[PDB]
Design a protein around this ligand. Structure first.
Ligand code: 0NJ
Length: 425
């Protein structure tokens, strides 16, 4: 009964060929050519980094990693609080088909070990404040040959920074603008290994490329407008943070970051950076339903607040911020990014929105498995090319989640309405 399978429409702009590395390289190269185009802004220290800086350093890291001997048989871990440097090794690795495993930077040694025992990285990039945990983990995982320091210019405590690592490995006369990223099979080559005990979620490059179609979609993403700035407190190592940010880079936006929440810094940043869009994890929505300080800031450039909710809290937050509603999205680590998203300007309080392009969604009767019609409640199941290739070295868990037909069973109860909006119950 195809009428009861909700399908995404055609993408505004058709799905681009190329790896995720190649598409990020191509977009970023263009922005790099316009001086002063801002990529990231650290709200705490107030430092800006431009696309030219970001592009050049990413390309230098890609080439240095290649000369060091990394290739598609290798993985790297990136372990760090949100920062200006976080995406440099992520981009450099995607440029060369090296899989990236973000490790949650508040994981202790035990959680870290389990994460990295699944990802098995050869090189670990880490912030200064994570160095000790990584040193303690390296002891039990000798596969880690090299630790590189992210937020340092010079060597740090006997370890190379990203800058001196690059200098150690670049050929003479290296040209960042002549560099060409690696081409490979984007379905077979893993881009990201995300954590979901925790398991490892393998995401081929293909899932990111589809995300980049959604990201710049005027209905399912953000329209590419100049001088667009986003404020993001979301962890970069979590799919919500990872896949929104990569998409913002494709778009040329200014990504203003915070690595720890504070009420004044956050509202003052919205005001002073004239933020157009803001990202909140769910507990920060409850937080701003309680806030009264919002009223004291000029938030007239704010177009949207995006949520990775209860209909009550979302309604209150929208009102406090003087917005028509909340831009909700629903996704799992296992689906790369959001597979249901509030279509631009067509929000419904309490809905998670509509099926994104390339995807499909249904709800099924709980004890049965039978597909259901409008306004009927059952388990949400989704099918599309952003679904993980699988949990790493764990086929039983993978087969328990995704059926022989490619349907991923979300575990959540939902229903969809006559306009094809989904509601999670
Ligand atoms: C509001 O728009 C968005 C855009 C991306 C997005 N990703 C989400 C997600 C991705 C991975 C894991 C968990 C998530 F909630 S929710 C969401 C919502």
């Amino acid at each position: 009964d195809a009428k009861n399978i909700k399908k995404g429409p055609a993408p505004f702009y058709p799905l681009e060929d190329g790896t995720a590395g190649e598409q990020l390289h191509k977009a970023m190269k263009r922005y790099a050519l316009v001086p002063g185009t801002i990529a990231f802004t650290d709200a705490h220290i107030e430092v800006n980094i431009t696309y030219a800086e970001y592009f050049e350093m990413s390309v230098r890291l890609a080439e240095a990693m290649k000369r060091y001997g990394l290739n598609t048989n290798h993985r790297i871990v990136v372990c760090s609080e949100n920062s200006l440097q976080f995406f440099m090794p992520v981009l450099g690795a995607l440029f060369i088909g090296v899989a990236v495993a973000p490790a949650n930077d508040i994981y202790n040694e035990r959680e870290l070990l389990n994460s990295m025992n699944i990802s098995q990285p050869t090189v670990v990039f880490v912030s200064k404040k994570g160095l000790q945990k990584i040193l303690n983990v390296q002891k039990k995982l000798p596969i880690i040959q090299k630790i590189i320091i992210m937020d340092s210019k010079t060597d740090y405590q006997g370890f190379q920074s990203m800058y001196t690592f690059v200098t150690s490995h670049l050929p003479p006369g290296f040209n960042e603008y002549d560099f060409v990223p690696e081409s490979f099979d984007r379905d077979k080559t893993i881009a990201l290994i995300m954590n979901s005990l925790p398991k490892g979620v393998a995401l081929p490059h293909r899932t990111a490329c589809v995300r980049f179609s959604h990201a710049r979609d005027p209905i399912f993403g953000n329209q590419i407008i100049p001088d667009t700035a986003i404020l993001s407190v979301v962890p970069f190592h979590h799919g919500f943070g990872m896949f929104t940010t990569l998409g913002y880079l494709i778009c040329g936006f200014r990504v203003v970051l915070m690595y720890r929440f504070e009420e004044e810094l956050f509202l003052r940043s919205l005001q002073d950076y004239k933020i157009q869009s803001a990202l909140l994890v769910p507990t920060l929505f409850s937080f701003f339903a309680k806030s009264t300080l919002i009223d004291k800031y000029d938030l007239s450039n704010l177009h949207e607040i995006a949520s990775g909710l209860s209909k009550e809290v979302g309604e209150a937050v929208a009102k406090r911020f003087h917005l028509p509603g909340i831009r909700q999205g629903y996704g799992l680590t296992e689906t790369t990014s959001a597979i249901l998203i509030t279509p631009e300007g067509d929000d419904k309080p309490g809905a998670v929105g509509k099926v994104v392009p390339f995807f499909e969604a249904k709800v099924v009767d709980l004890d049965t498995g039978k597909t259901l019609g409008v306004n009927q409640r059952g388990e949400l199941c989704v099918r599309g090319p952003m679904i993980m290739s699988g949990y790493v070295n764990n086929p039983e868990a993978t087969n328990a989640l995704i059926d022989k037909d490619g349907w991923l069973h979300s575990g959540d109860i939902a229903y969809w309405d006559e306009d094809e909006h989904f509601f999670i119950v």
